[PDB]
Amino acid sequence: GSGGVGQAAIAIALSRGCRVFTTVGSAEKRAYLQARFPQLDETCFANSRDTSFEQHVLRHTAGKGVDLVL
Amino acid sequence: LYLPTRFTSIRIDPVTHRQKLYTLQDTTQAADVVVDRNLNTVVAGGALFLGAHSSVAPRRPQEHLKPILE
Numbered sequence: 001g002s003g004g005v006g007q008a009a010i011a012i013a014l015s016r017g018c019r020v021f022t023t024v025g026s027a028e029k030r031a032y033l034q035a036r037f038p039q040l041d042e043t044c045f046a047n048s049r050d051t052s053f054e055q056h057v058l059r060h061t062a063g064k065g066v067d068l069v070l
Numbered sequence: 071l072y073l074p075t076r077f078t079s080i081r082i083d084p085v086t087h088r089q090k091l092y093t094l095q096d097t098t099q100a101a102d103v104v105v106d107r108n109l110n111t112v113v114a115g116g117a118l119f120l121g122a123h124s125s126v127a128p129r130r131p132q133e134h135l136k137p138i139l140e
Contacts, residue, residue, distance in 0.1 A: 055109050063108030 002029035007036075009070050014039055021057055021066060023048040071127045078121025087116020 001010045001022035013020055014037060023046045024030055030045055043060045046053035057066060091101045101115035112119045 055111075058109045061108075063110070 001033050001037075002026065006070075007033075010037055018067075020044050021046065021053075021060075023053045025049055071129060072124045073127050074122065074124045076121070076123040077119055078123075080117070080119055080122075082117040084116060090115040 001007055001020075002024045006022060010020060010022060010033075020037075020040065021044055022033065022040075024033065025048045033045075034040055046056035087101075091099055093099055103112065103114035105112050110121050110123075112122065
């Protein structure tokens with residue numbers, strides 16, 4: 001959601017009240033996003049340099065998973 | 071009755087496995103094991119399974135143990 005289509009894909013989904021889970025490479029990118037979209041918890045953010053995000057998404061999902069992946 | 075059938079990503083490192091291990095008072099050896107069925111990972115000493123799906127097998131009655139009904 002740091003990137004181009006991410007940023008939009010976030011805005012679109014948020015418009016419709018969807019629980020968002022975005023992943024990001026850089027500390028400072030967490031920053032920007034958090035500012036811009038205020039509706040974002042810290043639970044929303046996982047990593048992208050990595051596979052870590054599967055774990056992270058499986059926690060706050062209660063091993064249920066997500067409805068759509070972009 | 072359930073045997074294994076798929077693992078998704080086993081990962082062993084005997085280097086850390088040595089370190090993770092410990093000695094009881096029994097003098098024997100052991101380590102900690104954790105299961106996280108929300109993440110579907112098992113971890114123990116220096117080996118961690120991720121996504122270790124298993125599956126059902128049929129019990130094969132051994133008709134030499136057919137009990138006497140009086």
